[PDB]
Amino acid sequence: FENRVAEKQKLFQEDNGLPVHLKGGATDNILYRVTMTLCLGGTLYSLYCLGWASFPHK
Amino acid sequence: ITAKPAKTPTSPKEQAIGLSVTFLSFLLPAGWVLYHLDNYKKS
Amino acid sequence: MAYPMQLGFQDATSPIMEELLHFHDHTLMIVFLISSLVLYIISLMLTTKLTHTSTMDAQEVETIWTILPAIILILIALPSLRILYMMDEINNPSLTVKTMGHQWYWSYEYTDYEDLSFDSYMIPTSELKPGELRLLEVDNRVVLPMEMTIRMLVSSEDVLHSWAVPSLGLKTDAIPGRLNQTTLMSSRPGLYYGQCSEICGSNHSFMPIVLELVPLKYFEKWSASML
Amino acid sequence: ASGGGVPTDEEQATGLEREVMLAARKGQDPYNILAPKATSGTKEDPNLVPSITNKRIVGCICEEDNSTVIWFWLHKGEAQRCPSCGTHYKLVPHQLAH
Amino acid sequence: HYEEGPGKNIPFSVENKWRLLAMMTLFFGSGFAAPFFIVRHQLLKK
Amino acid sequence: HQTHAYHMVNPSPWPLTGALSALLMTSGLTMWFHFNSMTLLMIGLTTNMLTMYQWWRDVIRESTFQGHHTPAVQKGLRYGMILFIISEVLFFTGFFWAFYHSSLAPTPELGGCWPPTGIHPLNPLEVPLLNTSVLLASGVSITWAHHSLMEGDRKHMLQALFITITLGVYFTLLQASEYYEAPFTISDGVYGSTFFVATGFHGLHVIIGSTFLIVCFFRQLKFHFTSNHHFGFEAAAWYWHFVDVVWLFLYVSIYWWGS
Amino acid sequence: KIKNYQTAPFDSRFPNQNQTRNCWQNYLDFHRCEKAMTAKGGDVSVCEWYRRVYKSLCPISWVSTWDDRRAEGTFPGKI
Amino acid sequence: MFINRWLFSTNHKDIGTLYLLFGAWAGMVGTALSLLIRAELGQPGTLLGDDQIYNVVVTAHAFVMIFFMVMPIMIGGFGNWLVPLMIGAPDMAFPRMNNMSFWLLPPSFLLLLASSMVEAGAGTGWTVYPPLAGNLAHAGASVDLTIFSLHLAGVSSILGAINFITTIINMKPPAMSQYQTPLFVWSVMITAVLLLLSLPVLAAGITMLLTDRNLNTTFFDPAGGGDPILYQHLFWFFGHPEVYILILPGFGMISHIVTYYSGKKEPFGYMGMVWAMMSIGFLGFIVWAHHMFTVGMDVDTRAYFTSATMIIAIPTGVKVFSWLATLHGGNIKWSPAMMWALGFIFLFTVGGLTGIVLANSSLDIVLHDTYYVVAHFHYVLSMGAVFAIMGGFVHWFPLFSGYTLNDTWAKIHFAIMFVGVNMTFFPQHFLGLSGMPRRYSDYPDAYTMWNTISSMGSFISLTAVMLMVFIIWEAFASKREVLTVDLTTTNLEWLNGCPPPYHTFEEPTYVNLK
Amino acid sequence: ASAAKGDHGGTGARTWRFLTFGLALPSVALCTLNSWLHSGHRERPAFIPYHHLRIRTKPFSWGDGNHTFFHNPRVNPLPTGYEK
Ligand SMILES: CCCCCCCCCCCCCCCCCC(=O)OCC(COC(=O)CCCCCCCCCCCCCCCCC)OC(=O)CCCCCCCCCCCCCCCCC
Ligand code: HEA
Ligand code: HEA
Ligand SMILES: CCCCC/C=C\C/C=C\C/C=C\C/C=C\CCCC(=O)O[C@H](COC(=O)CCCCCCCCCCCCCCCCC)COP(=O)(O)OCCN
Ligand SMILES: CCCCC/C=C\C/C=C\C/C=C\C/C=C\CCCC(=O)O[C@H](COC(=O)CCCCCCCCCCCCCCCCC)COP(=O)(O)OCCN
Ligand SMILES: CCCCC/C=C/C/C=C\CCCCCCCC(=O)O[C@H](COC(=O)CCCCCCCCCCCCCCC)COP(=O)(O)OCC[N+](C)(C)C
Ligand SMILES: CCCCCC/C=C\CCCCCCCCCC(=O)O[C@H](COC(=O)CCCCCCCCCCCCCCC)COP(=O)(O)OC[C@@H](O)CO
Ligand SMILES: CCCCCC/C=C\CCCCCCCCCC(=O)O[C@H](COC(=O)CCCCCCCCCCCCCCC)COP(=O)(O)OC[C@@H](O)CO
Ligand SMILES: CCCCCC/C=C\CCCCCCCCCC(=O)O[C@H](COC(=O)CCCCCCCCCCCCCCC)COP(=O)(O)OC[C@@H](O)CO
Ligand SMILES: CCCCCCCCCCO[C@@H]1OC(CO)[C@@H](O[C@H]2O[C@@H](CO)[C@@H](O)[C@H](O)[C@@H]2O)[C@@H](O)[C@H]1O
Ligand SMILES: CCCCCCCCCCO[C@H]1O[C@H](CO)[C@@H](O[C@H]2O[C@@H](CO)[C@@H](O)[C@H](O)[C@@H]2O)[C@@H](O)[C@H]1O
Ligand SMILES: C[C@H](CCC(=O)O)[C@H]1CC[C@@H]2[C@H]3[C@H](O)C[C@@H]4C[C@@H](O)CC[C@]4(C)[C@@H]3C[C@@H](O)[C@@]21C
Ligand SMILES: C[C@H](CCC(=O)O)[C@H]1CC[C@H]2[C@@H]3[C@H](O)C[C@@H]4C[C@H](O)CC[C@]4(C)[C@H]3C[C@H](O)[C@]12C
Ligand code: CUA
Ligand SMILES: [Cu+2]
Ligand SMILES: [Mg+2]
Ligand code: NA
Ligand SMILES: [Zn+2]
Ligand SMILES: [Zn+2]
Ligand SMILES: [Zn+2]
Ligand SMILES: [Zn+2]
Ligand SMILES: [Zn+2]
Ligand SMILES: [Zn+2]
User: Fold this and answer.
1) How many of the other CB atoms lie within 10 Å of CB of H35?
2) Where exactly are the transmembrane stretches of this chain (chain C)?
3) Rounded to whole angstroms, how far apart are CA atoms H123 and H101?
């Protein structure tokens, strides 16, 4: 292996006003959307589940 | 502390409205459930 | 039992509860005094135009108000401990009765000689006889010999419960798998009430305790007949 | 039994930590890491309070071992005095980032 | 950069005192109301 | 624009995704325990993994790449880890309290003896002793790794770190086998209770610590660590020691004194 | 014979509010003393003491349960 | 831009604001629950049903008031708002983790509400003692959800504790020693430490309770060698510190408020106050069994706990007198906050004295589990902690909002709440002594009088809480912006104007080492 | 203690490697040797329906609700005894 830290320091300091969690490129975006989607979706689902369990099925 | 006069003065009339609206947001939903309490226990 | 508009403690029936009462009286005096002192002083600080906002020295007066409350706590712990040691005192009982909590009633067991046992339920408000106390009556009272040192063993067969008898100064938790001892001793004959003192479910408010303190003789007859 | 291959701070430090490291090599304190030593706080020898605007908040611990700190904005211009002990403080504006 | 100053440092708007009264009303009311409807809900299962 | 050493963090979504993944996990567990369904649990775990991955990727970015970790910022991160570890300790102390309570006053249902009647302890001089040596060994190999890094020796830091990791894994495997070969189960009363829970949690931390070390390994691989600035490694090491020491307490209390 | 038992007296081996062991002890002591006498040809009249004591202290259900277990062959205590 | 600022924040001020909002909402929920309680006990007989639904209410009342109202406000709110500013820090040490501490509470709350929704709820008491809380007497998800709720609330506060300590240690001006930081900053740190130490234990305990309920462990089940009493130890080990954790930040705010409105530049006996707070925090870790006097423990043990608990009165006595000394010779400003503070000083003393009464294991036998306990804790919580939160709120409102409140309306809110809470809780001293047990949906007829008066006071307090909401709106509706604020020389938090900018102390203060 | 060796003039990387290979690892070698010796499948004891073991207050959330997580047929009996 070779030290490529300098390449990464440059990329991440590249003044494009991007927040560190997206400053890595297009991938960051994708990962974040997946994450956020899952979280919110899962959250809805859970709300669903609380609803279901709130009522008796005798 | 010192402060500048109200930018949007709330006249007594407006306040009465505020106060009332406030108490009602508390008192009504409860008053409702509390009223139909009997209708709930055995239904 | 308690009467309407009661302020203090239910009258002392045992010598131990007579002890707690006298102790609570000197303790409460201090509680009043201090709380009223603070209040007065609060008022004292707030009733003057005179001022002194520059720095005030602390190490000199902190000796005063550390040592003072200090001496006071001791004037509460001393009688508190001697009395605590008292309740533990070895005494040698004449009888031994076990009680076991159950959701939601008390079962009793007098097994020194005979194999006597019985459940004890709260008399519903609907089946109370004229003059009988709501929520406080049971069908089977705990008959016991007045003026005798008795040993009560408490436990439970389900969740936690707690056996209490205010007038005699008693409260022992009913813990499943455990056998808690506590001594009873009434200085008088009569009926003595208590209530389950540990959340135990749906009817925790409804499973009281009544004790019937009669003389030895009647106690014996009752034991026999209860067979 | 030995060798290398591990970057040093000098070679890899970047960003703000590099700046601090560099400025620290020159005996400077741009990012207020050290506690400034007090002058005699007289009219003639005031405490030189650096800054990057026309004012900065000063905290005056009048006497050593005081628990209460006196705070006030130090304005560019005439040297001001601590409302408590009266020691003098003078703002000495801008630069830092060349 | 984020808006700074009175009425700007909050997540709810204070532009219109009436829209606000409504806002606050739904907020504080929804909370106060909740236990009651839960109680209600529990009584209605059996 | 700022004249202090501290770090002003770019607004991030992770705290939320994290708080949310917590909600999904706890729910996911309730769903499983009572309404037999892992679906919720599944997602929860997945988001938790993503949150942690991204949240720490960013912290690496902010330090190795952007250089925001000034000494003041690093000093603060030290207090942070030490404090975290302390709480972790107190957590374990809970389980130790439990075990000690149960074994010092055995109840009639066990037979008023410890171990209870019907319980056949693992030999502390067999695999348990081995695990003990493995973790102690990793403590040494991780210390060699540290002193190698501080002397700028890359090859040896890697060597030492690798071994350290291999040992943690080995412990985990040994423990997995021991869990299986165990004549007692978690359902075998207070013994099986205090046992599998305590050692179960410790095992988990072993996995976490190993994971952490694994991360430090790769970051080392990519040259992120300077011979003087390597807090990520410093922490994994502190954590690892905590794990090492907890095991010492377990071995002595549950496997040795408690058999 | 040397009896005239009112109720189990104070045992210096169990002086605290928890009596669980007291009961348990005496219940074990009896059934042990009982198995020795039934075995070596002697009279169970000697184990009387423990029987009275355990009986006085132990909750019927505990006794009932421990007995059901010595029979089922699943009593955890050593007798 | 809204999301980034409010869902993705990394600003200590914003986060404290979020906490303040959560805390206020939760206060409504908890007040509602408190009324449902006093309604049931309003007149004899049953109103809602048996003890199950009743106790599901009493339990939530506690969880909400404690974990969702008092802690989030005092610590996440006044903490995140005031601490950085009081020490001239740009923000918190881990401003991002600080955001997660916040976002855990809603899910935490959500789980709590969800436990009272499913099955029959968890009518177990806030202490969640087994076996009543076990999977048999309390089968179903209910208790399991309450647990997870605690977990989330737990993780949140633990992380929160770390942040506040790191921050208060590492981020002070280079010249400022720990003995140069404001009392409220001290109190926050100490509190953060108790949290750090106590919470993991509670976590271990409730986790054992969870397994017993879903994994067949028997930590608290006698059948397997367990003991219900163990859970109690584990719980109260955390439980006592927790009460102190609920009052320390209050002590902090009180010291600032009394000093401020006394017209003093500093609180009387600073070092004494630091000593006191640290002593308390300490002793609060070795007195938990005072909550178990009736489970029947050795008399030596019960002798120790009686002794130890009583000692806490000494450091605590110091603080009270210091507060009076701060008032001593001041130019008194009879503002609202001052009124709450003066209120607090007195009332809290009372609830503490009674706390001392309960310390006697002798006397506790008869008072344990009665209403005397309820009187004691409501005097220090619903009067102590609550008064302090009020005072802090009226005082620093200008600073947080930029607007001022109508002082007279505020003095009215004080008078109402004052009468309410006393009428509510003072009579409970009688019920306690006369034997009324806790957690009862109905009671014997002799206890009728006091229970009715109590319920009435609880209504005045309701009137008061509604009014407060109104007063808040009023200040937000009128918009009287802030101009000048006195005593800024010794109240650094106010020095950046009301409200200060998003980014404060970008340029550190200047403090001479000398 | 001081152990039974010496170094200390300077505790650096070479020293710690030395310990790793000349103590730590050999320790683990012996303990592995010993372990993979005293092993061997010990005769599973006679089953006894003890009421304090094999507890079941709620079915396990996996399988048929009656087998522990790391259930080993050879040594873990069910509430009703060993399996086929
Ligand atoms: C709301 C219902 C009131 C019912 C009153 C009594 C009726 C008696 C009939 C008829 C009376 C005569 C016949 C019966 C005698 C029974 C003696 C008994 O068994 O004796 C024991 C009993 C009764 O004790 C008494 O001997 C009653 C004492 C009452 C003290 C009241 C202070 C009240 C202040 C303002 C009003 C109350 C609300 C605000 C309270 C604010 C906190 C105190 O039980 C107690 O221990 C109750 C108190 C528990 C501890 C609270 C301690 C701190 C309280 C106040 C410090 C204030 C200092 C400044 C001075 C006070 C400044 C404000
Ligand atoms: C600090 C928490 C707290 C507070 C403030 C209170 C307040 C109230 N509580 Fe209580 N209560 C508990 C914690 C608290 N309580 C706990 C732990 C228990 C025991 C639980 C158990 O046994 O399991 C208990 C038990 C309990 C009982 C005994 C139940 C029983 O034994 O059956 C009763 C009944 O009288 C009661 C009454 C009240 C009343 C009338 C109030 C009223 O005084 C409330 C009046 C309303 C307020 C004072 C709300 C103000 C705060 C806000 C709304 C924030 C506002 C917004 C901003 C300023 C930002 N509470
Ligand atoms: C705000 C939280 C809070 C605070 C700070 C306190 C403070 C104290 N509490 Fe506690 N207490 C509770 C909340 C609090 N408490 C709660 C919630 C419960 C019920 C829990 C439950 O069951 O759910 C309770 C329960 C409780 C018990 C258990 C009773 C029982 O269940 O039977 C005991 C035991 O001793 C007690 C005592 C004390 C004591 C001695 C103090 C001391 O810290 C008080 C010290 C203060 C002073 C002493 C006043 C000032 C002093 C002077 C002016 C100097 C002079 C003093 C003397 C010389 C006497 N409290
Ligand atoms: C290989 C060594 C490492 C151990 C962990 C690895 C795999 C298990 C999965 C998760 C474990 C994580 C923590 C431990 C939690 C419970 C103890 C589990 C320890 C363990 O794995 O014990 C096993 C029981 O498995 C069981 O029930 C476990 C059932 C699995 C479901 C887990 C239950 C989840 C409950 C977690 C509660 C979370 C609360 C934590 C809060 C933290 C602070 C807020 C023992 O197997 P057994 O057949 O009974 O005896 C073996 C007989 N041959
Ligand atoms: C039977 C029970 C069973 C369970 C047991 C289970 C496990 C056992 C327990 C522990 C073992 C585990 C791991 C140990 C290995 C490493 C830990 C890390 C320590 C370390 O390596 O510390 C270093 C130095 O010492 C420093 O921190 C010193 C500074 C510390 C600061 C943090 C503390 C602040 C918190 C509150 C302060 C306390 C106040 C004391 C006075 C109170 C009086 C009552 C790092 O530097 P730094 O932070 O920049 O400080 C600058 C000061 N030199
Ligand atoms: C269990 C319950 C316990 C009950 C509590 C009992 C309370 C104690 C009662 C009395 C305390 C007596 C303290 C005596 C200090 C003298 C007061 C004084 O006069 O205050 C200053 C002293 O400084 C100083 O100690 C600093 C100022 C005064 C220092 C002490 C003031 C605070 C006292 C407490 C305030 C009331 C709260 C009491 C709490 C219950 C004035 O200074 P000098 O005269 O040098 O300079 C002025 C210039 N000359 C020389 C021209 C006059
Ligand atoms: C620590 C330094 C300060 C020193 C002061 C001493 C305080 C604690 C240490 C002492 C612990 C050992 C004492 C045991 C001796 C008695 C044996 C015994 O038997 O005690 C048992 C419980 O002990 C148990 O688990 C005890 C379990 C532990 C409880 C103590 C809690 C403190 C833990 C938190 C501190 C964090 C430290 C961080 C770790 C690095 C059971 O109770 P008994 O009442 O007997 O029930 C029997 C009845 O049938 C008859 O009455
Ligand atoms: C199957 C496996 C899944 C199990 C779930 C958990 C999984 C893995 C947990 C392992 C932890 C991974 C942590 C990796 C952190 C990487 C980021 C890092 O290490 O960040 C470092 C900072 O430390 C920092 O924030 C320190 C960060 C502290 C993180 C440690 C926390 C442990 C987490 C425990 C969670 C569970 C708690 C217990 C449950 C009861 C970066 O600073 P430096 O290294 O100095 O770099 C700068 C130099 O390059 C300059 O020249
Ligand atoms: C029933 C199941 C319950 C489940 C509950 C689960 C709750 C949450 C799950 C999701 C949380 C995981 C996501 C990763 C969190 C990492 C936090 C971290 O690593 O935080 C660091 C601070 O704490 C430090 O170092 C040192 C501290 C490291 C803390 C790691 C967080 C782990 C969370 C678990 C804690 C458990 C408590 C343990 C005791 C029982 C970084 O501080 P930031 O403000 O980010 O940055 C500051 C910048 O200068 C960095 O460049
Ligand atoms: C503890 C917190 C609660 C404090 C006490 C509540 C204060 C008063 C609330 C008033 O609320 C209501 O009053 C009613 C009675 O006046 C109701 O009307 C009802 O009653 C009727 C008139 O008698 C009917 O016209 C309708 O069907 C109706 O349901 C009812 O809806 C309810 O909103
Ligand atoms: C605080 C940190 C801790 C957070 C919580 C820890 C999470 C632990 C996850 C456990 O999840 C699992 O659950 C299952 C049960 O649904 C399994 O499948 C199993 O269970 C069955 C379903 O009934 C069977 O079909 C199979 O044989 C199989 O073994 C199993 O493999 C495992 O992954
Ligand atoms: C390639 C690298 C040398 C430095 C560089 O990257 O240029 C070498 C040197 C030392 C490292 C190794 C160490 O010698 C330790 C390990 C030993 C091997 O048996 C397997 C892989 C092993 C895990 C390592 C892989 C290897 O690729 C590394 C990473
Ligand atoms: C010595 C220490 C700090 C002094 C300082 O550096 O300013 C001070 C702070 C608080 C003081 C303590 C508090 O005043 C409480 C106690 C008061 C008694 O007057 C003496 C002991 C007593 C326990 C004090 C001893 C000592 O003077 C303390 C501990
Ligand atoms: Cu029995 Cu409550
Ligand atoms: Cu306490
Ligand atoms: Mg109790
Ligand atoms: Na009622
Ligand atoms: Zn000065
Ligand atoms: Zn800026
Ligand atoms: Zn560096
Ligand atoms: Zn290092
Ligand atoms: Zn059987
Ligand atoms: Zn800015």
Assistant:
1) 25
2) 15-45, 60-87
3) 28
Q: How far apart are CA F18 and CA G5, in angstroms?
A: 69
Q: Do chains D and F touch (3 or more CB pairs under 8 A)?
A: yes
CATH number of the domain bearing residue H311: 1.20.210.10
Please compute Rg for chain C using Cα positions.
Answer: 24
Ligand nearest to the CA of H501: 23
CA–CA separation, F42 and F40 (whole Å)? 5
CB of C150 closer than 8 Å to CB of C97? yes
**Alpha helices of B1-43 — where are they, by DSSP H?**
12-35, 37-41
Torsion of CA I10, I13, I15, I21, to 10 degrees: 170
Resolution, in Å, please? 2.7
**Ligand 14 proximity of C16 Cβ (cutoff 6 Å):** no
* H31 catalytically annotated: no
Q: Which residue from B minimizes the CA distance to E38?
A: B33
CATH number where D19 lies: 2.60.11.10
Q: For atom 16 of ligand 12, which residue has the closest CA? A: F159
Question: What are the domain boundaries of chain E?
Answer: 1-46
Q: Which of F68, F85, F111 is the last residue of a domain?
A: F68
**H61 phi, psi to nearest 5 deg:** -50, -50
Cis, bond preceding D46 (omega within 30 deg of 0): no
For chain F, the domain total comes to: 2
Instruction: Map chain F to HEC letters.
Output: CCCCCCCCCCCCCHHHHHHHHHHHHHHHHHHHHHHCCCHHHHHHHHHHHHHHHHHHHHHHHHHHHCCCCCHHHHHHHHHHHHHHHHHHHHHHHHHHHHHHHHHHCCCCCCCCCCCCCCCCCCCCCCHHHHHHHHHHHHHHHHHHHHHHHHCCEHHHHHHHHHHHHHHHHHHHHHHHHHHHHCCCCCCCHHHHHHHHHHHHHHHHHHHHHHHHHHHHHHHHHCCCCCCCCCHHHHHHHHHHHHHHHHHHHHHHHHHHHCC
Which method was it determined by?
Answer: X-ray
**H35 C-beta closer than 6 A to ligand 10:** yes
Q: Which residues contact E17 (CB under 8 A, 6 or more apart)?
A: B8, B10, B14, H473, H476, H477
The CA distance from H368 to H361, in Å, is 9
Q: Is F33 in the same domain as F112?
A: no
| Domain boundaries B1-43, corresponding CATH code | 4.10.81.10
Residue range(s) defining the domain that contains residue C108: 92-227
E1-46: CATH superfamily: Cytochrome c oxidase subunit VIIc (4.10.49.10)
* Span from the CA of H505 to the centroid of ligand 19 (angstroms): 9
Exactly one of H438, H439, H442, H474 is catalytic; name it.
H438
Amino acid at C152: M
Question: Of all atoms in ligand 7, which is nearest to the CA of residue G20?
Answer: 49
Question: What letters, b where the CB count within 10 A reaches 16 and e where it falls short, cover H333-352?
Answer: eebbbbbbbbbbbbbbbbbb
CATH topology of domain A1-58: Cytochrome C Oxidase; Chain J (4.10.91)
Residues with Cβ < 8 Å from H231, sequence gap 6 or more? H129, H130, H205, H208, H209, H219, H220
F66 and A9 within 8 Å at the Cβ level: the answer is: yes
Task: Return the biggest CA–CA distance within chain B.
Answer: 59
Q: Are H367 and H357 in contact (CB under 8 A)?
A: yes
User: Could you tell me the domains of chain I?
Assistant: 1-84 (4.10.95.10)
Do F22 and F92 lie in one domain? The reply is no
- Structural contact between residues D29 and D35, judged by C-beta atoms closer than 8 angstroms: no
- In chain H, which residues have their Cβ closer than 8 Å to the Cβ of E40? none
For residue H365, the CA-to-ligand 18 centroid distance in Å is 57
Q: How many domains does chain H have?
A: 1
CB contact at 8 A, C155 and C175: yes
C42, C75, C91 — which closes off a domain?
Answer: C91
Q: Which residue has the tokens 């309290």?
A: F97
